Amino acid sequence: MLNNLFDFIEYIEYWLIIVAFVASVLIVVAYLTVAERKTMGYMQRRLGPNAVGYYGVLMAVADALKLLSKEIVLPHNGDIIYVMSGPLISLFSVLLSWAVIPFGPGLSLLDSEYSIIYLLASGSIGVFGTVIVGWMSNSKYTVLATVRTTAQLISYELVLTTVVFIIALIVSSLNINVIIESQYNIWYIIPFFPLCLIFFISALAETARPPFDNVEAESELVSGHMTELSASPFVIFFLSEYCSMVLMSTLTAIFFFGGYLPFSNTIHHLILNLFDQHSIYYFIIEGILLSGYLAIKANFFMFSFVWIRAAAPRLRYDLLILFCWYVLLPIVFAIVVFAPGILYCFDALPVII
């Protein structure tokens, strides 16, 4: 062995890097479900899950394992194509969107000059996978929910796409990593505070989260498109929806809060000066530090997803259409003309460097 064992790890090293990447994202998604109930619980003056695992740390594990041990409801064993194709398209779409998220400089699985387009294009496929559940279905609540998913998609898709294009226009690049590194001297929350609200409002509508939870409105459509889903098809849709919440929270931190850039440059240098750069331990700490900055900013917006759910009532989707087309679109298309005019006036048209 020895030599063969050692260079076999080199042959498998990048697969473990991906497995660690997949594991890291699933841990956040699993414990976001726990964190939402804890956050809502204390805002509602209850506790939230604290009896499943020590202080409630196994609540996510129990929910998945219990649902994975449940019978799948379908007319026939060969009818898996009906209620499984939809959940898989939704899950594959959001998971592929994580390929362009950089945890540090150059630490993204996919890096390209069109990472922004890939991000928007990949998430649009997830919208398609949701409507497939109401595939000439005899469940009227699934059918009623499919109509509302299309209505919400029309609402947010134009606004969310145009907002990201304004951010890409300010840096003159469609690479996500370049957009993060362009925020060294200024975080785009300050120049584009209106766009951060609009991006978050669009994210709530995209993820079908309250106050835009018109798709899975329990008081209206029992469970929406999920009313007929049980066991594994229900987990996959539930897993993908909370994956999208983490993705859009991380994108809010990337487009407006500098991504992985440190909160304090002075403190960032102080912490990293303790470790020799000629040792591998420096790069572990730096990887923890940079992702920690991204984690802190994304945790706040994952908190904000839960926060808005516990404070605001639901808005009807026909009002959401008027809100997105009569209010958000005119404002965003004004800024898409405003921003290039300001930059040209001061001879500051952006270039890639």
Partner: protein
């Protein structure tokens, strides 16, 4: 093994046996996906992403129209076909996949030689925009005109008022 050949073999099988309108809106998506992937891996990743960004929005609008027009007709109807005639048809079709008859153009491999003269190195989308907004700006402004006509056209067709 070029697995895209198998994907198109399955798609051609399902296009012959498709019965209702939902299956047709799935043949469309089952067609764009092989196009997007093959463009991504061979010729243009830019246009692989442009296809996804634009066609998906068209697909969902197409799907929502199926809901408003589905009319019970083809769920209970019968088709005959025959498994043997389907597979024989697909076999004869698969025999001839040479869209071009220039054997040398299809068999002899070529290369290009790189040069270092292009020191200002930017993406294809920046050059496309550079030409589209400067030299072919008329083409862009006519396209803007056609998009405006569609907005007026859709209203004068659909709106009862």
């Amino acid at each position: 093994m070029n697995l895209e050949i198998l994907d198109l073999s399955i798609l051609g099988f399902y296009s012959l046996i498709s019965s209702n309108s939902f299956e047709s809106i799935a043949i469309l998506v089952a067609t764009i996906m092989p196009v997007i992937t093959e463009l991504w891996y061979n010729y243009s990743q830019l246009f692989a992403l442009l296809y996804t960004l634009i066609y998906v929005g068209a697909v969902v609008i197409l799907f929502v129209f199926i809901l408003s027009v589905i009319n019970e007709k083809e769920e209970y109807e019968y088709e005959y076909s025959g498994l043997f005639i389907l597979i024989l048809v697909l076999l004869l079709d698969d025999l001839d996949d040479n869209e071009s008859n220039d054997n040398d153009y299809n068999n002899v491999y070529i290369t290009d030689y790189a040069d270092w003269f292009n020191n200002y190195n930017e993406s294809d989308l920046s050059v496309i925009g550079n030409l589209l907004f400067t030299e072919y700006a008329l083409l862009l402004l006519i396209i803007s005109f056609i998009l405006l006509m569609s907005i007026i056209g859709l209203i004068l067709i659909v709106k009862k008022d």
